[PDB]
Design a protein around this motif. Structure first.
Motif, short mmCIF file in Angstrom:
data_model
loop_
_atom_site.label_atom_id
_atom_site.label_comp_id
_atom_site.label_asym_id
_atom_site.label_seq_id
_atom_site.Cartn_x
_atom_site.Cartn_y
_atom_site.Cartn_z
N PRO A 32 0.88 -1.36 0.02
CA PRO A 32 0.21 -0.06 -0.08
C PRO A 32 0.80 1.14 -0.07
O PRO A 32 0.31 2.30 -0.71
CB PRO A 32 -0.71 0.05 1.38
N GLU A 33 1.94 1.23 0.68
CA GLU A 33 2.75 2.34 0.96
C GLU A 33 3.75 2.64 -0.40
O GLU A 33 4.13 3.82 -0.77
CB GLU A 33 3.74 2.18 2.11
N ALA A 34 3.79 1.85 -1.43
CA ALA A 34 4.88 1.61 -2.54
C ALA A 34 4.36 2.79 -3.53
O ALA A 34 3.14 2.69 -3.95
CB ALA A 34 5.04 0.53 -3.04
N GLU A 35 5.17 3.43 -4.11
CA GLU A 35 5.03 4.58 -5.04
C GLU A 35 5.38 3.83 -6.43
O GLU A 35 6.32 3.44 -6.70
CB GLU A 35 5.85 5.73 -4.85
N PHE A 36 4.37 4.15 -7.33
CA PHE A 36 4.68 3.62 -8.76
C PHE A 36 5.80 4.10 -9.37
O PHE A 36 6.64 3.09 -9.83
CB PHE A 36 3.50 3.89 -9.58
N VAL A 37 6.01 5.44 -9.24
CA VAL A 37 7.22 5.93 -9.61
C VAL A 37 8.58 5.71 -9.08
O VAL A 37 9.42 4.74 -9.42
CB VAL A 37 6.92 7.36 -10.20
N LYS A 38 8.58 6.24 -7.66
CA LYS A 38 9.75 6.27 -7.02
C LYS A 38 10.22 4.83 -6.51
O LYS A 38 11.41 4.43 -6.75
CB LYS A 38 9.70 7.04 -6.00
N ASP A 39 9.24 4.02 -6.03
CA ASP A 39 9.71 2.79 -5.47
C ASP A 39 9.44 1.60 -6.66
O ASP A 39 10.46 0.57 -6.43
CB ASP A 39 8.62 2.31 -4.28
N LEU A 40 8.55 1.76 -7.39
CA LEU A 40 8.36 0.66 -8.18
C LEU A 40 9.01 0.48 -9.72
O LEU A 40 9.06 -0.18 -10.56
CB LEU A 40 6.99 0.00 -8.37
N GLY A 41 9.63 1.46 -9.88
CA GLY A 41 10.38 1.86 -11.02
C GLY A 41 9.56 2.27 -12.46
O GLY A 41 10.03 2.38 -13.54
N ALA A 42 8.18 2.80 -12.21
CA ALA A 42 7.46 3.00 -13.37
C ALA A 42 7.68 4.31 -13.93
O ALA A 42 8.42 5.17 -13.41
CB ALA A 42 5.83 2.97 -12.93
N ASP A 43 7.33 4.63 -15.21
CA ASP A 43 7.44 5.85 -15.60
C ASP A 43 6.03 6.16 -16.19
O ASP A 43 5.22 5.58 -16.01
CB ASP A 43 8.37 6.15 -16.87
N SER A 44 6.04 7.73 -16.06
CA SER A 44 4.46 8.15 -16.25
C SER A 44 3.64 7.44 -17.29
O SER A 44 2.44 7.25 -16.94
CB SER A 44 4.62 9.69 -16.54
N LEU A 45 4.07 7.02 -18.33
CA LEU A 45 3.39 6.03 -19.27
C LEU A 45 3.00 4.69 -18.62
O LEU A 45 1.78 4.40 -19.16
CB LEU A 45 4.19 6.10 -20.47
N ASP A 46 4.14 4.23 -18.09
CA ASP A 46 3.56 2.89 -17.43
C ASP A 46 2.39 2.88 -16.63
O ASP A 46 1.71 2.14 -16.58
CB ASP A 46 4.83 2.46 -16.68
N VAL A 47 2.23 4.12 -15.77
CA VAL A 47 0.74 4.36 -15.00
C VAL A 47 -0.28 4.29 -15.72
O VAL A 47 -1.44 3.82 -15.29
CB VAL A 47 1.25 5.22 -13.73
N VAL A 48 -0.20 4.96 -16.94
CA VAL A 48 -1.19 5.25 -17.80
C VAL A 48 -1.66 3.63 -18.31
O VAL A 48 -2.74 3.48 -18.36
CB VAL A 48 -0.93 6.18 -19.08
N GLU A 49 -0.67 3.01 -18.66
CA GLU A 49 -1.00 1.63 -19.11
C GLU A 49 -1.68 0.90 -18.09
O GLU A 49 -2.62 0.34 -18.25
CB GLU A 49 0.28 1.03 -19.80
N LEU A 50 -0.97 0.92 -16.86
CA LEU A 50 -1.47 0.14 -15.51
C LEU A 50 -3.10 0.59 -15.32
O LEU A 50 -3.75 -0.24 -14.90
CB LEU A 50 -0.70 0.40 -14.34
N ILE A 51 -3.30 1.80 -15.24
CA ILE A 51 -4.52 2.32 -14.78
C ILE A 51 -5.44 1.98 -15.91
O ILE A 51 -6.75 1.38 -15.64
CB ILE A 51 -4.47 4.07 -15.04
N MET A 52 -5.40 1.83 -17.38
CA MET A 52 -6.16 1.49 -18.32
C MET A 52 -6.57 -0.14 -18.24
O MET A 52 -7.58 -0.57 -18.56
CB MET A 52 -5.69 1.92 -19.68
N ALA A 53 -5.52 -0.91 -17.63
CA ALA A 53 -5.50 -2.47 -17.58
C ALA A 53 -6.68 -2.44 -16.50
O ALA A 53 -7.39 -3.33 -16.33
CB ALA A 53 -4.29 -3.07 -17.43
N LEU A 54 -6.37 -1.66 -15.51
CA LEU A 54 -7.32 -1.71 -13.99
C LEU A 54 -8.92 -1.50 -14.47
O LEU A 54 -9.50 -2.08 -13.81
CB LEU A 54 -6.76 -0.87 -13.24
N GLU A 55 -8.95 -0.12 -15.04
CA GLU A 55 -10.28 0.11 -15.64
C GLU A 55 -10.87 -0.92 -16.58
O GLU A 55 -11.87 -1.25 -16.16
CB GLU A 55 -10.38 1.36 -16.62
#
Length: 74
Positions: free
Chosen positions: A23-46
């Motif tokens: 729960p505490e883990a950040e997409f960018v800083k902790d998990l190594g994502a870039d802004s586009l990675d989170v965009v893809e992740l969000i779309m997969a979740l939706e």
């Protein structure tokens, strides 16, 4: 459980281990994502959870807690 579920989608999308995806883990800083990675992740979740995340909300989402607490609140 909704956590294990989303955590699974996160770990496979961002190619990291489940134990990292806290729960505490950040997409960018902790998990190594870039802004586009989170965009893809969000779309997969939706897709997976058939729920729309308005943009105002999607941009507020910093960590895995933010995403979880949204899906389940909606």
């Amino acid at each position: 459980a909704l956590f294990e579920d989303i955590q699974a989608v996160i770990a496979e999308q961002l190619n990291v281990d489940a134990a990292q995806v806290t729960p505490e883990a950040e997409f960018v800083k902790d998990l190594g994502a870039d802004s586009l990675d989170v965009v893809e992740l969000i779309m997969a979740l939706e897709e997976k959870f058939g729920i729309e995340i308005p943009d105002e909300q999607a941009e507020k989402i910093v960590n895995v807690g933010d995403v979880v607490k949204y899906i389940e609140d909606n």
